């Protein structure tokens, strides 16, 4: 359920990931001085690893997502039960307040 | 309909996909430095510049819609997942069950008590010669 | 007056049944499954006629303090008011606690029997019914069941008076809801 929405996000980190390995491979490609060919190597396959990743994870999302729709409402709810619990807190409250009352008039008598 | 969406979905992912590969690939395309011939060095070379400042800034463009794209797969499955929302409503009816019997269990005993009491008031009043 | 039904059938491989009970959970009323479970009998009397008069009895398990019900269901109508659906006449009864005895006495005979268990849900006026279907051998005893195939049956079913049009397009609308996972169609009780 919350899975879901944990890899979305880590999707999210991989594209940004993407963006800033690809930007390091083009500060190599420009200095006279390109001496880690590995790597360079290292780096393309960076990008190669990453691009597809990202597409295979919205891939198949998407046919999860053309398995589970069917275009409808859903139109189940939980207003009832709720509607009895507030029920039952304001019976509580109730037994507290005449309880008080009561409280201060003995505390009234008892005292001359 | 539904299967419309989805497939517009799936266009865009595409789109986008192959737009930034395409892109990357004309980059290294420009890239193979060789001898010039009737070209005016320094206006390809100004417009070379331009035209890679354009591609970085389709770079960007396409990152940026990719963020869009995750956010509306985000909103789509949570609003029309039927087994998802069903957790959440059987969690719900739960807790509120439990809720309620705490507090009916706690008046029935101070009910009770106070019968008790009330009991042993009446009588201790009702003997009296006043 | 006269009762009419209207039937569509299907069915569901069991490896995949969980999606389409959490669809018709997401689809059907707000209430809760009730999980029943059925012994059946046939009854056959073979007069004169060449079609022999068939009846259905039926019995409740899981429930104690339930009477039995008996139903008649007569031929298919080739009329062409509604083609969408199975449309037949249906006769049910609610009966006492010694229906064999006065039926075995009129002259029917028992022919097979089986156990259906499954899940029931509403929506409206229409009743969705998924089951499973066991096979009885040593007919005394029911304890003695195995599994017949390796897939679930799907029933909608509407129940109403005669005429009453416009019905049989609100079952193919409902049926159409559930076509990736299930497909229902009218099909004839002939092979």
Redesign the interface.
């Known amino acids: 359920l919350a899975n879901e929405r944990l890899r979305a996000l880590e999707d999210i980190e991989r594209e940004i990931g993407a963006i800033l390995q690809n930007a390091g491979t083009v500060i190599l490609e420009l200095s006279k001085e390109k001496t880690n060919e590995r790597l360079l190597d290292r780096q393309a396959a960076a990008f190669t690893a990453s691009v597809q990743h990202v597409e295979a994870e919205l891939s198949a999302q998407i046919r999860y997502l053309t ?1 589970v729709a ?1 275009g ?1 409402p ?4 939980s207003y009832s039960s709720r509607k009895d619990c507030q029920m039952a807190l304001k019976r509580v409250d109730y037994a507290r307040l005449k309880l008080s009352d009561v409280a201060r008039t003995c505390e009234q008598m008892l005292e001359n | 309909s539904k299967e419309t969406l989805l497939q517009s979905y799936n266009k865009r992912l595409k789109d986008d996909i192959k737009s930034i590969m395409d892109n990357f690939t004309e980059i290294i395309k420009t890239a193979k430095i060789e001898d010039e011939t009737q070209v005016s060095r320094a206006t390809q070379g100004e417009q070379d510049n331009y035209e890679m400042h354009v591609r970085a800034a389709n770079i960007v463009r396409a990152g940026e819609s990719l963020m869009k794209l995750v956010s509306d797969l985000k909103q789509f499955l949570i609003l029309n997942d ?2 998802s ?2 957790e959440a409503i059987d969690q719900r009816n739960q807790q509120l069950r439990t809720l309620q019997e705490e507090c009916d269990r706690k008046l029935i005993t101070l009910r009770d008590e106070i019968s008790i009491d009330l009991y042993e008031l009446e009588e201790e009043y009702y003997s009296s010669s006043s | 007056i006269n009762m009419m039904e209207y039937l569509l059938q299907g069915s569901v491989l069991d490896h995949s049944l969980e ?1 389409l009970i ?2 018709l ?3 059907c009323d ?1 209430m809760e499954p009730e999980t029943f479970l059925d012994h059946e009998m046939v009854f056959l009397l073979k007069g004169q006629q060449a079609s022999p008069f068939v009846l259905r009895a039926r019995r409740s398990m899981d429930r104690a303090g339930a009477p039995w019900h008996l139903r008649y269901l007569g031929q298919p109508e080739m009329g062409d008011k509604n083609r969408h659906a199975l449309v037949r006449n249906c006769v049910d009864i609610a009966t006492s606690e010694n229906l064999t005895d006065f039926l075995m006495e009129m002259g029917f005979r028992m022919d097979h029997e089986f156990v259906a268990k499954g899940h029931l849900f509403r929506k409206g006026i229409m009743k969705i019914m998924v089951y499973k279907i066991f096979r009885i051998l040593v007919p005394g005893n029911t304890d003695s069941t195995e599994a017949l195939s390796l897939s679930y049956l799907v029933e909608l079913s509407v129940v109403a008076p005669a005429g009453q049009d416009m019905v049989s397009d609100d079952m193919k609308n409902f049926a159409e ?1 559930l076509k ?1 996972l299930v497909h229902l169609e009218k099909i004839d009780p002939k092979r």
């Open positions: 398995q069917t409808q859903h139109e189940g709810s | 039927f087994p929302v069903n | 999606s959490h669809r959970r997401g689809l707000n809801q990736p």
